[model samples]
Target chain A: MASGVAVSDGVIKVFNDMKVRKSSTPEEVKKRKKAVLFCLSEDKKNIILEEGKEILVGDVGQTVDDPYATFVKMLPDKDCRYALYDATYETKESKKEDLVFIFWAPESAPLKSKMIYASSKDAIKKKLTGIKHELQANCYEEVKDRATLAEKLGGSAVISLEGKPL
Target chain B: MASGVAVSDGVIKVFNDMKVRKSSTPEEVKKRKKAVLFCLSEDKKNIILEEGKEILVGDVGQTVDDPYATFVKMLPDKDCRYALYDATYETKESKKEDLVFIFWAPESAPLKSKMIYASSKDAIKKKLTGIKHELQANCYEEVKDRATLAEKLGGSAVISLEGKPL
Candidate 1:
């Protein structure tokens, strides 16, 4: 139940329902960001990312004060996205497996949806805890850009915003 | 990097390096299963799932205690995979976003490869922790069949083994 417009940035803007906007303002963006995050943590105990869909991209952190708090990047094609970490999982039976988590948004969502910390619920909870604790204990600093931010964080930032780093 | 043989009874066997096997024995089957899981955790932390390609499927849990383990599902197209969660993200700078996470196994992978949970380091870690803990705390109950197993897992399973559930 969705429709979309492919933007000039090679990204498609998808709308789940008819209530939509062609653009947003800075203040509205900030409020929407918080609202989206609230929506994410409210409905489900764990967030799940589907393969092959568009993604909601953002940096990790509670406050947008450091290099981690950059512009939220968006990519229309999930196939174009890659993993941001090195992770593995297994059963007690010793059958090992790999794991991937991505920040995603769906077309069938409100216009002000937050980038989901997409992955297994196990992973999202762990990440949320880890990031929150780390931020609380450490002083936030600025990095050159998203790539540097990704390097510092052990993840990859492949999206560009307005031809600049996120 | 991958070649496959489409077999009857809803199974598509793939080869990462083209050393093809048209069929398997109970003995060979057990060994292959172990090998597949082993391969899943061996390499790069970020497992790659190709878009517009077929997929290899399995389940989440500690052991192959049910029909859920029977057939590794395959999707000839990557566009069909979508995250199971509703999520979004953004900043005050006016950039909005979305996220999706998927466990994908590319048909282009070496035939012996296993599926990958592709996402972020933080998310994958959390998901692995959550799933392992949940499965460990739960019981190994019987599921009616593979399709039922897929239904319960919020995923689709398309493979069968030995004319029985995998």
Candidate 2:
């Protein structure tokens, strides 16, 4: 309710559950849903978590070490979606992971489609608090590589561009 | 207050005043600020309004018709910014004006910026009710053309992308 449109039913619950599960002891990791995709309702007024719009860490017996792949593959070619990736990647220190927010606004999507995703994005971002990184990807190339995620996760906040700095 | 970062002092008040002024009678138009520029505070944790961070429809002795140009030039090339443009454009009908929200997040800018701007945008958006349109422009090319504005001004919303639809 902190946004222009309302989050659909159970949208918050799935996110909360996945977040808590991901942060829990690694033993419960296999039980957690690694990716949860959110969409706008048909009337285009609410964020909905419809059935079939979710993914688990694994399908059935296999433990998904690459949910990021699943998340990427799930992004529609002509539409936009909001998703959370419990991204686990290798690091020298330890196997590290981060809860990343991905707004998949593909290039081929219609104008209104992209606009709704952009406008309604903050609604979910606010509800899903504690995200390690937020990727405002407008195309596949931006997120196709994990390195971009690394940069965003490791980058510091600031601003830049034309006219110049304040 | 509804976002990850705080808005600076008087930011909300200035916005309110500007919003009210822009909506006033045509006679009061000249006195109203036609453009408002906002930036992240130096700390990068709050949206701030600096001394030279605002613009009017026209400079003294001139009534501005192309404040859109002024708004465009004011966007900092090296930074992310939030602005309101009292956009007046001519169609076959009357000269219509719309209060449009511009998010100037240059691609050449830093990653933390896109995240910060993406995250903190809704704060100002929430406060500034009745925004006619929101442009999440990542680079000058996305916004340099006035035609793009017209498209978003007239578009509708929906969703799509990889895997499939619901």
Candidate 3:
């Protein structure tokens, strides 16, 4: 699994429908289906979980056409470890705020990639920190696809560290 | 004049026809046309003139249909200030050794570029020294043209300092 951040857009909206694991209790772990959630705010700052939600594990085992679920199903075809993770945040008293997350998966195998759990967010933060520095320094330009971005940065895969050519 | 070195090859042989004036009398500088010569060994290690002859001076002016002469004649079209100075050297045994000089003209203007006299060899040496470092470190790859080399290294000209980009 390659790890990195995802920015927000239509791609990110898919994950919103999925829920984190409600509990880590052994029975819950075995019985409940879960997805991990990390969020990046719309301003391109901050990476965190779905505030108040520890894990993505509610509504277990039902299928949906939502973006996040489709993303998981399509992970095998996606070449990038990094993709835009986007969503909206709103409260009863405040207007909705768009949130973006840089998503990264370390394992290439779908099942192996899912090894990332809630705790993995911290690791994501560290990787994003390096990217933040690069972006601030104007070290890279955007391309239409991850493969091109990877090639421009001198990497075999996008969202890598030293391998990404500058 | 942009100063730099030339690694020898068949292309380097074209300079053999030119001559630099020599004189022992100091005040007769006006009467003498001198050119300084320097050579880099085939192994790319040594940079010096032939054993006993330190300077180059010979025939005043003549014409030749050769690359070196053509290069000199076309200096106005080139942006680089470095070039070759070639001549003959004779020892006590009267052995004539073909001497080649690395010449540099500092001015950017095409017409002003030919200001390099035999005395300019020392200045050429200083410039070639920097090139030696780059070659040793393998900073550049051979290209068909200077502009291509410059573009590959991120510069408008191939033989420049920091701005020449690598």
Best by lDDT: 2
Q: What TM-scores do the predictions have?
A: 0.19, 0.46, 0.17
For candidate 3, the TM-score of chain A alone relative to the native chain A: 0.23
Interface RMSD of 3: 19.0
| TM-score of candidate 1's A chain against the true A chain | 0.21
For model 3, the local distance difference test gives 0.31
| Model 1 CA lDDT for position A98 | 19
Model 1 CA lDDT for position B162: 21
* lDDT per residue as tens, model 2, A22-104: 45676667657777777787777788775675567555245434555556777888877888776555443454556778777
Q: Tens digit of lDDT per residue, candidate 3, span B26-68?
A: 4443233233334434443334443322222222333322223
Measured by DockQ, the strongest candidate is 2
Per-model interface RMSD values are: 16.6, 4.9, 19.0
Candidate 2, residue B93: Cα displacement in angstroms equals 3.3
lDDT of 3 by residue, A1-166 (tens): 2234443343233343322333446554433323334444443244444432222223333443233333344332312233332222223343222223333332222321322322244445443332321100000111213333233333343343112222
lDDT score at residue A119, model 3, on the 0-100 scale = 27
Fraction of true contacts kept, per model? Answer: 0.00, 0.00, 0.00
Q: Where in model 1 is the C-alpha error above 4 Å?
A: A1-166, B1-35, B38-117, B120-145, B148-162
Higher-lDDT candidate of 2 and 3: 2
